[PDB]
Amino acid sequence: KVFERCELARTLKRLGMDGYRGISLANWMCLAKWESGGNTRATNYNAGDRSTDYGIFQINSRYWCNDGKTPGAVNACHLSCSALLQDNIADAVACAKRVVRDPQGIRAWVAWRNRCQNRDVRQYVQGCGV
């Protein structure tokens, strides 16, 4: 599924992402936008370390989900990476919350650092009623 902007904002808000561990909804929106364009079936293979990024937040298989083919990987979210490719983003959100409970918080994703940190992210939620 490829989310429309405000549709995603409300979806994430209902799933409890607004202010989760101090992270605003606009920050999550900026993350999804830059990670996959709001595409839940997006995947990115990393030939360098044999891992794959899955779903709307492009969560990596080395540490977060199990895909069975990533060498010496772990599964901190306790999900099959397949769960991160569903149209329903509930499991992906559950895993994104798990990611940010670690020390780095939202900084876990480098794309957030590159395109969202210290930027005007208000534009992502304006007019969405969130």
mmCIF file of C-alpha atoms in Angstrom:
data_model
loop_
_atom_site.group_PDB
_atom_site.id
_atom_site.type_symbol
_atom_site.label_atom_id
_atom_site.label_comp_id
_atom_site.label_asym_id
_atom_site.label_seq_id
_atom_site.Cartn_x
_atom_site.Cartn_y
_atom_site.Cartn_z
ATOM 1 C CA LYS A 1 0.000 0.000 0.000
ATOM 2 C CA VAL A 2 1.198 3.528 -0.816
ATOM 3 C CA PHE A 3 -0.245 5.922 1.769
ATOM 4 C CA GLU A 4 -1.486 9.387 0.986
ATOM 5 C CA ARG A 5 -0.008 12.015 3.343
ATOM 6 C CA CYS A 6 -2.896 12.840 5.723
ATOM 7 C CA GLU A 7 -4.166 9.252 5.614
ATOM 8 C CA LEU A 8 -0.824 8.149 7.042
ATOM 9 C CA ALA A 9 -0.796 10.957 9.652
ATOM 10 C CA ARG A 10 -4.140 9.866 11.100
ATOM 11 C CA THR A 11 -3.195 6.178 10.843
ATOM 12 C CA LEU A 12 0.001 6.771 12.839
ATOM 13 C CA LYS A 13 -1.835 8.975 15.332
ATOM 14 C CA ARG A 14 -4.440 6.229 15.969
ATOM 15 C CA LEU A 15 -1.587 3.740 16.473
ATOM 16 C CA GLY A 16 -0.193 5.949 19.266
ATOM 17 C CA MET A 17 2.845 7.425 17.541
ATOM 18 C CA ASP A 18 2.212 11.060 18.398
ATOM 19 C CA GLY A 19 4.833 11.970 20.977
ATOM 20 C CA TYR A 20 5.919 8.366 21.483
ATOM 21 C CA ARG A 21 9.173 8.601 23.498
ATOM 22 C CA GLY A 22 9.026 12.337 22.774
ATOM 23 C CA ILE A 23 8.865 11.936 19.000
ATOM 24 C CA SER A 24 6.249 14.104 17.282
ATOM 25 C CA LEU A 25 3.933 12.794 14.530
ATOM 26 C CA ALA A 26 5.573 15.160 11.985
ATOM 27 C CA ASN A 27 8.947 13.498 12.692
ATOM 28 C CA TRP A 28 7.478 10.020 12.007
ATOM 29 C CA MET A 29 5.878 11.375 8.813
ATOM 30 C CA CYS A 30 9.219 12.846 7.677
ATOM 31 C CA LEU A 31 10.799 9.455 8.388
ATOM 32 C CA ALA A 32 8.237 7.435 6.388
ATOM 33 C CA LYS A 33 8.321 9.927 3.514
ATOM 34 C CA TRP A 34 12.094 9.750 3.167
ATOM 35 C CA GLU A 35 12.408 6.036 3.917
ATOM 36 C CA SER A 36 9.819 4.656 1.491
ATOM 37 C CA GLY A 37 7.527 7.418 0.267
ATOM 38 C CA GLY A 38 4.821 5.837 2.386
ATOM 39 C CA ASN A 39 5.112 2.493 0.553
ATOM 40 C CA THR A 40 4.542 -0.504 2.860
ATOM 41 C CA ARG A 41 5.992 -3.046 0.382
ATOM 42 C CA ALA A 42 9.247 -1.140 -0.193
ATOM 43 C CA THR A 43 12.432 -3.240 0.209
ATOM 44 C CA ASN A 44 16.115 -2.397 -0.066
ATOM 45 C CA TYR A 45 18.821 -5.041 -0.289
ATOM 46 C CA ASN A 46 22.200 -4.174 1.207
ATOM 47 C CA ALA A 47 24.785 -6.188 -0.777
ATOM 48 C CA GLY A 48 27.541 -5.055 1.598
ATOM 49 C CA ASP A 49 26.276 -6.823 4.697
ATOM 50 C CA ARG A 50 23.583 -9.110 3.257
ATOM 51 C CA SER A 51 20.696 -7.455 5.092
ATOM 52 C CA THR A 52 17.402 -6.032 3.814
ATOM 53 C CA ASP A 53 15.335 -2.983 4.851
ATOM 54 C CA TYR A 54 11.593 -3.665 5.024
ATOM 55 C CA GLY A 55 8.407 -1.656 4.769
ATOM 56 C CA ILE A 56 7.281 1.874 5.346
ATOM 57 C CA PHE A 57 10.093 2.637 7.839
ATOM 58 C CA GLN A 58 12.676 0.448 6.035
ATOM 59 C CA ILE A 59 13.491 -1.538 9.173
ATOM 60 C CA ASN A 60 16.678 -3.607 8.820
ATOM 61 C CA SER A 61 16.829 -7.402 9.141
ATOM 62 C CA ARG A 62 20.216 -7.526 10.893
ATOM 63 C CA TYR A 63 18.728 -6.415 14.189
ATOM 64 C CA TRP A 64 14.958 -5.971 14.050
ATOM 65 C CA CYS A 65 13.138 -8.706 12.181
ATOM 66 C CA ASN A 66 13.885 -12.240 11.061
ATOM 67 C CA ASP A 67 14.068 -13.070 7.339
ATOM 68 C CA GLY A 68 16.180 -16.212 7.809
ATOM 69 C CA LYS A 69 18.851 -15.118 5.297
ATOM 70 C CA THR A 70 20.809 -12.380 7.143
ATOM 71 C CA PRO A 71 24.065 -13.774 8.625
ATOM 72 C CA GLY A 72 24.285 -13.676 12.414
ATOM 73 C CA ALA A 73 21.242 -11.412 12.582
ATOM 74 C CA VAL A 74 18.930 -10.971 15.552
ATOM 75 C CA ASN A 75 15.174 -10.277 15.806
ATOM 76 C CA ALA A 76 14.618 -7.624 18.489
ATOM 77 C CA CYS A 77 11.017 -6.920 17.403
ATOM 78 C CA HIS A 78 10.237 -10.652 17.364
ATOM 79 C CA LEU A 79 8.545 -10.468 13.944
ATOM 80 C CA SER A 80 9.053 -12.148 10.615
ATOM 81 C CA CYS A 81 10.244 -9.421 8.251
ATOM 82 C CA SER A 82 7.099 -10.367 6.285
ATOM 83 C CA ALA A 83 5.020 -8.619 8.986
ATOM 84 C CA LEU A 84 6.777 -5.387 7.910
ATOM 85 C CA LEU A 85 5.391 -5.701 4.371
ATOM 86 C CA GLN A 86 1.661 -5.692 5.266
ATOM 87 C CA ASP A 87 -0.805 -3.006 4.119
ATOM 88 C CA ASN A 88 -1.780 -2.738 7.794
ATOM 89 C CA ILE A 89 1.114 -0.937 9.511
ATOM 90 C CA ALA A 90 0.304 -1.964 13.120
ATOM 91 C CA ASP A 91 3.209 -4.433 13.404
ATOM 92 C CA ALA A 92 5.620 -2.016 11.637
ATOM 93 C CA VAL A 93 4.618 0.697 14.131
ATOM 94 C CA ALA A 94 5.083 -1.755 17.047
ATOM 95 C CA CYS A 95 8.577 -2.456 15.721
ATOM 96 C CA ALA A 96 9.395 1.254 15.078
ATOM 97 C CA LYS A 97 8.452 1.943 18.725
ATOM 98 C CA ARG A 98 10.807 -0.885 19.760
ATOM 99 C CA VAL A 99 13.602 0.684 17.719
ATOM 100 C CA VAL A 100 13.243 4.051 19.429
ATOM 101 C CA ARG A 101 13.158 2.612 22.937
ATOM 102 C CA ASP A 102 16.931 2.119 22.455
ATOM 103 C CA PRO A 103 19.405 4.944 23.331
ATOM 104 C CA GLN A 104 19.471 6.559 19.880
ATOM 105 C CA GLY A 105 15.751 7.177 19.715
ATOM 106 C CA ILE A 106 14.626 8.533 16.318
ATOM 107 C CA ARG A 107 18.300 8.956 15.350
ATOM 108 C CA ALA A 108 18.402 5.177 14.672
ATOM 109 C CA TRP A 109 17.535 5.935 11.027
ATOM 110 C CA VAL A 110 20.296 7.872 9.241
ATOM 111 C CA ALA A 111 17.770 9.191 6.710
ATOM 112 C CA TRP A 112 16.031 10.942 9.671
ATOM 113 C CA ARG A 113 19.340 12.597 10.559
ATOM 114 C CA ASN A 114 19.900 13.628 6.925
ATOM 115 C CA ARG A 115 16.425 14.870 5.972
ATOM 116 C CA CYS A 116 14.533 15.478 9.210
ATOM 117 C CA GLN A 117 16.812 16.519 12.052
ATOM 118 C CA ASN A 118 16.748 20.269 12.656
ATOM 119 C CA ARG A 119 14.460 20.791 9.681
ATOM 120 C CA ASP A 120 10.992 22.329 9.382
ATOM 121 C CA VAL A 121 8.863 19.141 9.491
ATOM 122 C CA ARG A 122 5.520 20.931 10.117
ATOM 123 C CA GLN A 123 4.722 20.584 6.419
ATOM 124 C CA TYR A 124 4.187 16.846 6.790
ATOM 125 C CA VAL A 125 1.102 17.141 9.050
ATOM 126 C CA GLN A 126 -0.447 20.446 8.032
ATOM 127 C CA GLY A 127 -4.118 20.096 7.095
ATOM 128 C CA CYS A 128 -4.360 16.495 8.286
ATOM 129 C CA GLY A 129 -6.345 17.253 11.431
ATOM 130 C CA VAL A 130 -3.830 15.649 13.772
#
